[PDB]
Amino acid sequence: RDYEIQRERIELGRCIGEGQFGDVHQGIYMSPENPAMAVAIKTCKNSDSVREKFLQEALTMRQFDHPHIVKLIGVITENPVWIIMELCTLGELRSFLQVRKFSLDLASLILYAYQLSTALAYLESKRFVHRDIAARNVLVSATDCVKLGDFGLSRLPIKWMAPESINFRRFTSASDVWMFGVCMWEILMHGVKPFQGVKNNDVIGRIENGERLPMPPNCPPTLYSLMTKCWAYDPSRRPRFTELKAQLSTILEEEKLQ
Numbered sequence: 001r002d003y004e005i006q007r008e009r010i011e012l013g014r015c016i017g018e019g020q021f022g023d024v025h026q027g028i029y030m031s032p033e034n035p036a037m038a039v040a041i042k043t044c045k046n047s048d049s050v051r052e053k054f055l056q057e058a059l060t061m062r063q064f065d066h067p068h069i070v071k072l073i074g075v076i077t078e079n080p081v082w083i084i085m086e087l088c089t090l091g092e093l094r095s096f097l098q099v100r101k102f103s104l105d106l107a108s109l110i111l112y113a114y115q116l117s118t119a120l121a122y123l124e125s126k127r128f129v130h131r132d133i134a135a136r137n138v139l140v141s142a143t144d145c146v147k148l149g150d151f152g153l154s155r156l157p158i159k160w161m162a163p164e165s166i167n168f169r170r171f172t173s174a175s176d177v178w179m180f181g182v183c184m185w186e187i188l189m190h191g192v193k194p195f196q197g198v199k200n201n202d203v204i205g206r207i208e209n210g211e212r213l214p215m216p217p218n219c220p221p222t223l224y225s226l227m228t229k230c231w232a233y234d235p236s237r238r239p240r241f242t243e244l245k246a247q248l249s250t251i252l253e254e255e256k257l258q
């Protein structure tokens with residue numbers, strides 16, 4: 001139906017980040033049914049050239065409907081242009097993992113990997129290639145719930161990219177699977193970035209030498225083995241996301257009954 005929201009139904013609040021287009025705020029949305037709802041508000045500092053690209057990102061999220069992908073709520077298309085998104089109260093995943101490193105049990109880390117794999121198996125089933133899977137693009141809705149962030153605000157990430165993406169600019173769901181392996185490593189490392197202190201240009205040579213990100217401390221070997229399957233050099237030998245989801249379900253259940 002209609003995605004336009006009357007500005008008077010939005011109470012703007014504090015800033016919580018930025019983007020290619022401007023600051024992101026949190027706020028409150030009063031609709032006739034379910035008021036009042038907590039939301040994120042994307043703002044655009046500048047034009048009509050930028051207005052074009054800004055609102056196309058909202059269009060992009062319109063096609064998706066998954067419990068572990070942030071929802072588009074609506075848009076305000078008169079200046080100042082706003083995009084209204086579902087709020088993930090607890091913010092960016094990397095910061096959350098760093099702050100709560102010694103307060104999070106392993107079962108929660110595995111839960112986050114599983115939840116993200118369900119979102120990515122959904123995108124794979126829609127034949128949608130993401131190209132920017134990384135912990136920096138995950139949001140924390142609750143201590144038991146993470147979500148892929150807005151795809152526009154997700155937008156080279158060499159240290160996450162599959163070799164065929166680095167070498168030949170090939171992007172498929174199988175190259176997404178490689179990136180997801182790196183994302184899983186980031187989670188089990190409590191938000192450390194991959195290949196710290198390594199130059200981007202040196203990454204592909206290490207991959208082609210057979211080198212891989214090592215097993216994170218306290219990571220179950222079955223889960224690290226799953227990561228290494230995402231990093232098969234030949235993309236046809238990587239699991240599909242629906243297989244990763246099935247394997248993550250059993251790893252999760254063995255760690256803690258759901």
Ligand SMILES: CCC(=O)NCCNc1c(NCc2ccc(Nc3ncc(Cl)c(Nc4ccccc4C(=O)NC)n3)cc2)c(=O)c1=O
Pocket residue numbers: 014015016017018024026040070085086087088089090091092095096136137138139148149150151153154
């Ligand atoms: C409470 C009032 C206040 O002043 N708080 C200051 C903030 N202090 C702290 C935290 N919260 C930051 C924070 C909080 C909530 C979000 N929820 C959110 N929800 C939906 C989208 Cl769509 C979104 N989008 C994005 C927004 C920004 C950046 C990227 C995306 C994105 O989508 N990336 C893929 N971000 C994102 C970031 C901490 O944690 C912490 O400390």
